[PDB]
């Protein structure tokens, strides 16, 4: 077992800049390295073989460098379609192994989230379960702090968050926080508030509704 | 041109068998190295097995003795027998053309194999009400709540695919109950709440569930 | 023209770790493969596995695969047999055998390594006289409650050897060994001759010279 | 009238594994003591026969196969082994009776330039039968379209070059392997020991 | 996993006679089909490491005396010792080396043969020094008897005892080829002093009727 460590875990660069990706190995593989690109929802595509040779149909802006234990993948003049997760694979020793991958995101002006809150549906209330959904729409950067406060009391352990991939048009993220409670617990409270902390917000924004 | 199409993925109880097929075009499967690579639903790529051009088969340590790779020259299809499946084997299995046991120059679309003792359940679709708390100026937010389904995936459309601008369908989140929950929200003009009609099309083939839920202003 | 030498006798508690040695010396050790044979007390030979020191290729019998690990160090021409959690069943003598190839007869053998898993310590034997109250009479000594083996018993400091029968040790339910050594002497020498049995137990540093005479 | 074992082991140059050399040894006296007691061999593995008991037996013919492979591929020179070398370069029968002698040759077969003229077969539609030598240099057709002798898509050169470098790991370093095979057919015997 | 079973388990052959040990193989043991069976015979004297005698079913090891010979083919194999001598007393194993799971036979004990000799039976009461510690050991001695098969029963006050006796048997004597057995009855002082008569009944082939040696506490 030989481990390929990739750095950084995620990379944020604007289009037209130069991206440099690192891939270090547990042992020396001596240029027996390959590079792949995997856009979301798709299979990996071969980019570099032999740690320097370019695969057919790949633009000249992709180059491979390094040998032994240190390897570098450099992309010049980033295009909006050149942003995905890039994996390095070694074939100098069995088993053939991959790295964790490096996420490559585009970079945009800090955009404040638009906070929306949805009370549980009356139809869902009939089944005995209440789910309150808080929507953070079209914000950047991805990092965002969402806290559920019911009757001005912090809630923990009953909330799950989901984050979309970076949008193709506005280069933003969307986040959904859902607070699930039973009807009995739900009807034991009055005010359900979603407090959102983000870089683009001067002060935290709270959207709240009454049952 | 080279094409690789996979089939045979789905839900299976632990210990049960499964066979994955890979239709190949543009090259002879009896003359090329071919490999199976699985990507976990969240983790990285792992090479599973390889078949040489001469017919030799090699398998990873985590699948040796349980996975058997095979090819059918007459059907030009690559196969992968799973036999004693485990929960840890739950991943998306890719079919890739191997160049001399070095690297994978072509890849198939990948098929999802889920191994769990959980049982298939259809999704419950609940409307995310567009209200005063989901509207600001012209921007109005509405969506649907696809909750408590298993296994993945679930496809969500709005107005039968006519509405695609401003639609955000979040990745499914595995709850503590062992089921999946998902939401799909759109952004619409506030003036269209009373005039336009918004319906979310939810389809869950593993449970043969198709739900068209209408969302109305509160 | 090659020889094999193994490690010393090991006495361990159950659950301990053990690692016995087997070093070869001769012309042509490079071609020789080393294999380990287990022989339980009073049992036949059991083949466990074989390893080649040059590349450390370990082939295991299906009966000893997950319960023992065979390694080697080609720098010092030594093969190793290792246990992680010793069990009471592993109390046996282990031989390493020499063969100059896989699927070849084993020519060179080691002297053997004795392994004892008992959950007992070192205790000195107790020597008791056997009463000579018997054409001809017989007397002897009783060596009881000692651990571990062996015990060497002599009569008149090795002067009396004809007609002496020293029985093999027997493992009692207490976990300690017992032994009896007897001699055959004419019945006319009971009052005249004096018979003394010398019992030595080097593991316990016990040396008892026990005089026996009719009661 | 000793057998020329020095020619095989003490050879200035060695052949590639895909074009492995075999020297037929017959009508001579084989003194193995000069061979098996040397300490210059990293691996000396014998199957079916024992070198210490060869100075007394006789055989009709003895074959010595010479080639250069990688350290990771020395494991493949053995009966019942699979791999690129074992399937496409040099295959030993499951009932093999002989010895495989390998020693490191980093000092001899490596060059700082990062390349050498040592080759192995990378592509082949079927595995080699035991003691079979394929020295074809024809473009390997991985598709249905004929290659017409020009390398391209679905058309690769069947051979690959080792990147033997002195700075590589021990596994990547070149190893010289000599395989001794003993043949016994119903015929007069020509190779006997001292 | 090639199984090797050899018969007989025990063999009694007089000096100067022929001893034969058959070895049966579950599967054929031949490598490369070169008409060479990959089988070996080993000799293990008591308390000594095994020594290789014959390899490849007919070839004697260096220094092996000419009286040893190997034979057989297929799945039936045999080892014959013509003119058996006193130094050949050992346990013989047939071992195959044609597959990775090397297998041994269960062994064949070889003993010289003797005109049946009856045992000399002696009984030893526990010593007074041992009686102080609170444990009593009663020893019954069977000296210079053949064959090895002997039955010893401990009867205290004509009541059969069970579970409190252990027997020990010596190897064959190098000159008169006789066995010796020691049976030890271990009891506490309380149990020992709860009875009067301790008897040792011996049943042997060389005895017309059982012989009993007893004593009173
Ligand atoms: C290769 O030649 C060398 C000499 O250059 C041989 O090594 C010596 O061989 C002679 C007999 O030919 C021995 O007496 C010496 O002891 C050997 N010396 C060493 C250092 O080994 C060597 O045997 C030849 N290699 C072969 C025959 O494989």
Residue B149 has, within 13 A of its CA and on its CB side, a CA count of 27
Please, which residues have CB within 8 angstroms of residue D10's CB and are 6 or more apart in sequence?
A: none
Print burial letters for B165-175: b (CB count within 10 Å at least 16), e (below 16): ebebbbebeee
* Residue from the list E38, E107, E180 with its beta carbon closest to the beta carbon of C44: E107
Please, which residues have CB within 8 angstroms of residue D92's CB and are 6 or more apart in sequence?
A: D77, D78, D79, D81, D86, D100, D130, D131, D179
Assess whether A69 and A158 both reside in one domain.
Answer: no
Q: CA C1, CA C17: separation in Å to the nearest integer? A: 34
CA of D142 vs chain B CAs: smallest distance (Å):
5
- Taking the alpha carbons of E140, E146, E149, E155 in that order, is the dihedral positive or negative? negative
- Whether C102 and chain D come into contact, CB under 8 Å, resolves to yes
Please name every residue paired with E210 in a beta bridge, in sequence order, or none if there are none.
none
> Counting beta carbons within 10 angstroms of the beta carbon of residue C10, is it exposed (0 to 12), middle (13 to 18) or buried (19 or more)?
middle
Expressed in Å, this structure's resolution amounts to: 3.5
- Ligand 1, atom 26, lies closest to the CA of D6
* Residue from the list D124, D144, D154 with its beta carbon closest to the beta carbon of B54: D124
Q: Please state the separation of Cα B119 from the chain's center in Å.
A: 17
Q: CA C105, CA B138: separation in Å to the nearest integer? A: 92
Contact predicate A172/A140, CB 8 Å? yes
CATH number, domain with residue B186: 2.60.40.10
Helices and strands per DSSP (H, E), number in chain D: 4, 12
Q: CA E128, CA E209: separation in Å to the nearest integer? A: 33
Q: By residue range, what is the domain housing residue D158?
A: 114-165
Tokens encoding C14:
């159950």
Contact predicate A156/A147, CB 8 Å? no
Q: CA E56, CA E29: separation in Å to the nearest integer? A: 10
Q: CA C177, CA C143: separation in Å to the nearest integer? A: 8
Diameter over CA atoms, chain E? 73
Helix (H) or strand (E) holding E190: helix E189-192
User: Which atom of ligand 1 is found nearest the CA of D6?
Assistant: 27
Q: Tell whether omega for the bond before B190 is within 30 degrees of 0, i.e. cis.
A: no
A101 vs B contacts (CB less than 8 Å): 44
Assess whether D37 and D7 both reside in one domain.
Answer: yes
A30 vs D contacts (CB less than 8 Å): 163, 165, 168-169, 172
Q: Tell whether omega for the bond before B157 is within 30 degrees of 0, i.e. cis.
A: no
User: Which atom of ligand 1 is found nearest the CA of D5?
Assistant: 27
Rounded to the nearest 5°, which phi and psi values hold at E192?
Answer: -65, -40
Q: CA D68, CA D46: separation in Å to the nearest integer? A: 19
- Ligand 1, atom 13, lies closest to the CA of D34
Diameter over CA atoms, chain B? 68
> Counting beta carbons within 10 angstroms of the beta carbon of residue C114, is it exposed (0 to 12), middle (13 to 18) or buried (19 or more)?
buried
Q: Please state the separation of Cα D55 from the chain's center in Å.
A: 24
Q: By residue range, what is the domain housing residue B61?
A: 3-115
The last residue of a domain, from among A106, A123, A149: A106
> Residue B110 — left, alpha, or beta (φ > 0 → left; ψ -120 to 50 → alpha)?
left
CATH number, domain with residue C100: 2.60.40.10
Rounded to the nearest 5°, which phi and psi values hold at E153?
Answer: -120, 135
Assess whether E126 and E200 both reside in one domain.
Answer: yes
Tokens encoding A64:
């491979």
Q: CA B155, CA B205: separation in Å to the nearest integer? A: 9
Q: CA B59, CA B69: separation in Å to the nearest integer? A: 8
- Ligand 1, atom 18, lies closest to the CA of D38
Which candidate, C21, C45, E29, E52, places its Cα nearest to that of D52? E52
Tokens encoding B2:
């080279």
Q: CA E217, CA E111: separation in Å to the nearest integer? A: 40
Please, which residues have CB within 8 angstroms of residue A63's CB and are 6 or more apart in sequence?
A: A48, A52, A54, A73, A74, A75, A76
Q: Please state the separation of Cα D81 from the chain's center in Å.
A: 14
Tokens encoding B118:
């959980």
Please, which residues have CB within 8 angstroms of residue C111's CB and are 6 or more apart in sequence?
A: C5, C6, E49
| Cβ within 8 Å, pair D154-B26 | yes
Q: Please state the separation of Cα E135 from the chain's center in Å.
A: 31
| Ligand 1 binding site (Cβ under 6 Å of any ligand atom) | D 5-6, 9-10, 34-35, 38
The last residue of a domain, from among E61, E79, E112: E112
How distant, in Å, are the alpha carbons of A177, B3, B41 from that of B151? 21, 27, 12
Contact predicate B159/B186, CB 8 Å? no
- Whether C61 and chain E come into contact, CB under 8 Å, resolves to yes
How distant, in Å, are the alpha carbons of A37, B6, B76 from that of B3? 18, 10, 11
Which candidate, B73, B80, B81, places its Cα nearest to that of B95? B80
How distant, in Å, are the alpha carbons of B107, B127, C140, D128 from that of B95? 6, 39, 82, 27
Which candidate, E121, E95, E93, E77, places its Cα nearest to that of E214? E121
D165 vs A contacts (CB less than 8 Å): 30
Q: CA C73, CA C55: separation in Å to the nearest integer? A: 10
Assess whether C72 and C175 both reside in one domain.
Answer: no
Tokens encoding E86:
């006193």
Contact predicate B146/B182, CB 8 Å? yes
Contact predicate A97/A3, CB 8 Å? yes
Contact predicate B111/B155, CB 8 Å? no
Which candidate, A6, A20, A8, A11, places its Cα nearest to that of A75? A20
Give chain B as a 3 state SS string: CCEEEEECCCEECCCCCCEEEEEEECCCCCCCEEEEEEECCCCCEEEEEEECCCCCEEECCCCCCCCEEEEECCCCEEEEECCCCCHHHCEEEEEEEEECCCEEEEECCCEEEEECCCCCECCEEEEECCCHHHEECCEEEEEEEEEEEECCCCEEEECCCCECCCEEECCCEECCCCCEEEEEEEEEEHHHCCCCCEEEEEEEHHHCEEEEEEECCC
Contact predicate C73/C82, CB 8 Å? no
Q: CA A97, CA A33: separation in Å to the nearest integer? A: 10
Which candidate, C129, C130, C128, C132, places its Cα nearest to that of C188? C132
* Residue from the list E49, E103, E129 with its beta carbon closest to the beta carbon of C110: E49
The last residue of a domain, from among C70, C94, C117: C117
Q: CA B149, CA D173: separation in Å to the nearest integer? A: 55
- In testing the pocket of ligand 1, which one of D34, D36, D40, D64 has its CB within 8 Å of the most ligand atoms? D34
Distance from Cα C71 to the centre of ligand 1, integer Å: 31
- In testing the pocket of ligand 1, which one of D7, D30, D38 has its CB within 8 Å of the most ligand atoms? D38
The last residue of a domain, from among B115, B138, B159: B115
Helix (H) or strand (E) holding E128: helix E128-133
Assess whether C67 and C14 both reside in one domain.
Answer: yes
Assess whether D124 and D49 both reside in one domain.
Answer: no
Q: How many domains, chain C?
A: 2
CA of B181 vs chain A CAs: smallest distance (Å):
9
- Whether D163 and chain A come into contact, CB under 8 Å, resolves to yes
Count of beta carbons in the 10 Å neighbourhood of residue D87: 21
| Cβ within 8 Å, pair C144-E1 | no
CA of A96 vs chain D CAs: smallest distance (Å):
14
Which candidate, D175, D171, D162, D93, places its Cα nearest to that of D127? D93
Residue whose structure tokens are 């290729």: C57
Q: Tell whether omega for the bond before C64 is within 30 degrees of 0, i.e. cis.
A: no
Q: CA A5, CA C3: separation in Å to the nearest integer? A: 49
Please, which residues have CB within 8 angstroms of residue D27's CB and are 6 or more apart in sequence?
A: D190, D191
Distance from Cα C101 to the centre of ligand 1, integer Å: 23
Angle at the Cα of B190 from the Cα atoms of B188 and B194, rounded to 5 degrees: 100
Q: CA D194, CA B163: separation in Å to the nearest integer? A: 93
CATH number, domain with residue E164: 2.60.40.10
Contact predicate E114/E175, CB 8 Å? no
Q: How many domains, chain E?
A: 2
For chain D, strand residue ranges (E) read 21-25, 28-29, 43-47, 58-59, 61-70, 98-104, 119-121, 140-141, 155-156, 159-161, 174-183, 191-192
The last residue of a domain, from among E112, E135, E168: E112
Helix (H, G, I), strand (E, B) or coil at E189: helix
Q: CA D127, CA D125: separation in Å to the nearest integer? A: 7
Mutate to test the interface with E, among D45, D78, D95 (most CBs of E within 10 A): D95
Assess whether E87 and E138 both reside in one domain.
Answer: no
- Taking the alpha carbons of A185, A189, A190, A193 in that order, is the dihedral positive or negative? negative
Which candidate, E183, E84, C59, places its Cα nearest to that of D47? C59
CA of E87 vs chain C CAs: smallest distance (Å):
20
* Residue from the list A91, A119, A124 with its beta carbon closest to the beta carbon of B102: A91
Q: CA A95, CA B47: separation in Å to the nearest integer? A: 8
Count of beta carbons in the 10 Å neighbourhood of residue A81: 9
Tokens encoding A200:
């683009």
Assess whether A8 and A80 both reside in one domain.
Answer: yes
Q: CA D51, CA C28: separation in Å to the nearest integer? A: 9
CA of B58 vs chain D CAs: smallest distance (Å):
9
Which candidate, A156, A211, A208, A159, places its Cα nearest to that of A189? A211
Q: How many domains, chain D?
A: 2
Rounded to the nearest 5°, which phi and psi values hold at C179?
Answer: -150, 150
Method of structure determination: X-ray
| Cβ within 8 Å, pair B181-A55 | no
Neighbours of chain E (3+ CB pairs under 8 A): C, D
Assess whether B85 and B145 both reside in one domain.
Answer: no
| Cβ within 8 Å, pair C54-D48 | no
Assess whether D15 and D92 both reside in one domain.
Answer: yes
Beta C113-117 vs C10-12: how paired, if at all?
parallel
Assess whether B86 and B175 both reside in one domain.
Answer: no
Contact predicate B27/B53, CB 8 Å? no
DSSP E146: B
Which candidate, C10, C53, C32, places its Cα nearest to that of C97? C32
| Cβ within 8 Å, pair A96-B47 | yes
Q: What strand order describes the sheet that includes A205-210?
A: A153-155, A145-150, A191-197, A205-210
Neighbours of chain D (3+ CB pairs under 8 A): A, B, C, E
Q: CA D50, CA D52: separation in Å to the nearest integer? A: 6
Assess whether C99 and C10 both reside in one domain.
Answer: yes
- Ligand 1, atom 28, lies closest to the CA of D9
DSSP E117: B
Q: How many domains, chain B?
A: 2
Assess whether C163 and C75 both reside in one domain.
Answer: no
Neighbours of chain C (3+ CB pairs under 8 A): D, E
Assess whether B67 and B149 both reside in one domain.
Answer: no
Q: CA A182, CA D16: separation in Å to the nearest integer? A: 74
Which candidate, D180, D181, D179, D177, places its Cα nearest to that of D67? D177
Q: CA C91, CA C72: separation in Å to the nearest integer? A: 23
The last residue of a domain, from among C95, C117, C139: C117
CA of D50 vs chain E CAs: smallest distance (Å):
12
Breaks (C-N over 2.5 A) in chain B follow: none
Size of interface B-D (CB pairs under 8 A): 42
| Cβ within 8 Å, pair D144-B56 | no
Please name every residue paired with A182 in a beta bridge, in sequence order, or none if there are none.
A129
Assess whether D108 and D170 both reside in one domain.
Answer: yes
Helix (H) or strand (E) holding A73: strand A70-75
Q: CA B43, CA A2: separation in Å to the nearest integer? A: 17
A52 vs B contacts (CB less than 8 Å): none
Q: What is the dihedral of CA A13, A17, A18, A20, to 10 degrees?
A: 0
Helix (H) or strand (E) holding A124: helix A122-126
Helix (H, G, I), strand (E, B) or coil at C209: strand
Tokens encoding D169:
């790991």
Helix (H, G, I), strand (E, B) or coil at C17: coil
Assess whether B136 and B182 both reside in one domain.
Answer: yes
Rounded to a whole number of angstroms, the distance between the first and last alpha carbons of chain B is 53
Assess whether E210 and E129 both reside in one domain.
Answer: yes
Q: By residue range, what is the domain housing residue E75?
A: 4-112
Assess whether A71 and A160 both reside in one domain.
Answer: no
Tokens encoding A35:
């590079």
Mutate to test the interface with D, among E28, E32, E33 (most CBs of D within 10 A): E32
Q: By residue range, what is the domain housing residue C202?
A: 126-212
| Cβ within 8 Å, pair D47-C27 | no
* Residue from the list D72, D153, D163 with its beta carbon closest to the beta carbon of A30: D163
Which candidate, D8, D14, D15, D19, places its Cα nearest to that of D128? D19
DSSP E127: P
Tokens encoding B44:
């990285």
Q: CA C149, CA C122: separation in Å to the nearest integer? A: 10
Size of interface C-E (CB pairs under 8 A): 122
């Amino acid at each position: 077992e030989i481990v390929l460590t990739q750095s950084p875990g995620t990379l944020s660069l604007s289009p037209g800049e130069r991206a440099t990706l690192s891939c270090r190995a547990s042992q020396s593989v001596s240029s027996y390295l390959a590079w792949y690109q995997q856009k979301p929802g798709q299979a990996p595509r071969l980019l570099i073989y032999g740690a320097s040779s370019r695969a057919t149909g790949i633009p000249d802006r992709f180059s491979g460098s390094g040998s032994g234990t240190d390897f570098t993948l450099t992309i010049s003049r980033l295009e909006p379609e050149d942003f995905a997760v890039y994996y390095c694979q070694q074939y100098g020793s069995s088993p053939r192994t991959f790295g964790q991958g490096t996420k490559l995101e585009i970079k945009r002006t800090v955009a404040a989230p638009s906070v929306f809150i949805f009370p549980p549906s009356d139809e869902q209330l009939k089944s005995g379960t209440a789910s309150v959904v808080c929507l953070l729409n079209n914000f950047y950067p991805r990092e965002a702090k969402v806290q559920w406060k019911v009757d001005n009391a912090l809630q923990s352990g009953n909330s799950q968050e989901s984050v979309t991939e970076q949008d193709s048009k506005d280069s933003t993220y969307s986040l959904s926080s859902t607070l699930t409670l039973s009807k009995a617990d739900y009807e034991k409270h009055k005010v359900y508030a979603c407090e959102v902390t983000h870089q683009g917000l001067s002060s935290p924004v709270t959207k709240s509704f009454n049952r | 041109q080279v094409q690789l199409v996979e089939s045979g993925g789905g839900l299976i109880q632990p210990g049960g068998s499964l066979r994955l097929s890979c239709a190949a075009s543009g090259f002879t499967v009896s003359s090329n190295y071919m490999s199976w690579v699985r990507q976990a639903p969240g983790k990285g790529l792992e090479w599973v097995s390889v078949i040489y051009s001469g017919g030799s088969t090699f398998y990873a340590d985590s699948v040796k003795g349980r996975f058997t790779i095979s090819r059918d020259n007459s059907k030009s299809t690559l196969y992968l027998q799973m036999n004693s499946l485990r929960v840890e084997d739950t991943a998306v299995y890719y079919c890739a053309r191997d160049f001399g046991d070095f690297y994978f120059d072509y890849w198939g679309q990948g098929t999802l194999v889920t191994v769990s003792s959980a049982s298939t359940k259809g999704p419950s679709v609940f409307p995310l009400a567009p209200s005063s708390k989901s509207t600001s100026g012209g921007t109005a937010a509405l969506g649907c709540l696809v909750k408590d389904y298993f296994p993945e995936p679930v496809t969500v459309s709005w107005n039968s695919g006519a509405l695609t601008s401003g639609v955000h369908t979040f990745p499914a989140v595995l709850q503590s109950s062992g089921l999946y929950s998902l939401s799909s929200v759109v952004t619409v003009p506030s003036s269209s709440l009373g005039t336009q009609t918004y319906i979310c099309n939810v389809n869950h083939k593993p449970s043969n569930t198709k739900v068209d839920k209408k969302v109305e202003p509160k | 023209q090659m020889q094999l030498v193994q490690s010393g006798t090991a006495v361990k508690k159950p659950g301990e770790s053990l690692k016995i040695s087997c070093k070869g010396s001769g012309y042509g050790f490079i071609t020789y493969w080393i294999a380990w044979v287990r022989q339980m007390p009073g049992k036949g030979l059991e083949w466990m596995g074989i390893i080649y020191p040059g590349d450390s290729e370990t082939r295991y019998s299906p009966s000893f695969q997950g319960q023992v690990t065979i390694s080697a160090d080609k720098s010092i021409n030594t093969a190793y047999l290792q246990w992680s959690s010793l069990k009471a069943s592993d109390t046996a003598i282990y031989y390493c055998a020499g063969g100059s190839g896989i699927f070849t007869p084993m020519d060179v053998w080691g002297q053997g390594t004795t392994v004892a898993v008992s959950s007992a310590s070192t205790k000195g034997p107790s020597v008791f006289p056997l009463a000579p109250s018997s054409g001809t009479a017989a007397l002897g000594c009783l060596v009881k409650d000692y651990f571990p083996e062996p015990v060497t018993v002599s009569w008149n400091s090795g002067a009396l050897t004809s007609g002496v029968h020293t029985f093999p040790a027997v493992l009692q339910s207490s976990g300690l060994y017992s032994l009896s050594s007897v001699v055959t002497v004419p019945s006319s020498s009971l009052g005249t001759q004096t018979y003394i049995c010398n019992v030595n137990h080097k593991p316990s540093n016990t040396k008892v010279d026990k005089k026996v005479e009719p009661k | 009238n000793l057998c020329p074992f020095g020619e095989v082991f003490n050879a200035t140059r060695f052949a590639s594994v895909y074009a492995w050399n075999r020297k037929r040894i017959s009508n001579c006296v084989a003194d193995y003591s000069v061979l098996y007691n040397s300490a210059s061999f990293s691996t000396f593995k014998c199957y079916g026969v024992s070198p210490t008991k060869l100075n007394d037996l006789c055989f009709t013919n003895v074959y010595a196969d010479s080639f250069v492979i990688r350290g990771d591929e020395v494991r493949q020179i053995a009966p019942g082994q699979t791999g690129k070398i074992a399937d496409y370069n040099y295959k030993l029968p499951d009932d093999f009776t002989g010895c495989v002698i390998a020693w490191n040759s980093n000092n001899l077969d490596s060059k700082v330039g990062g390349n050498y003229n040592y080759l192995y077969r990378l592509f082949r539609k079927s595995n080699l039968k035991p003691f079979e030598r394929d020295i074809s240099t024809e473009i390997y057709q991985a598709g249905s379209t004929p290659c017409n002798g020009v390398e391209g898509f679905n058309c690769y050169f069947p051979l690959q070059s080792y990147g033997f470098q002195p700075t590589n790991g021990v596994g990547y370093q070149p190893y010289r392997v000599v395989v001794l095979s003993f043949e016994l057919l119903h015929a007069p015997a020509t190779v006997c020991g001292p």
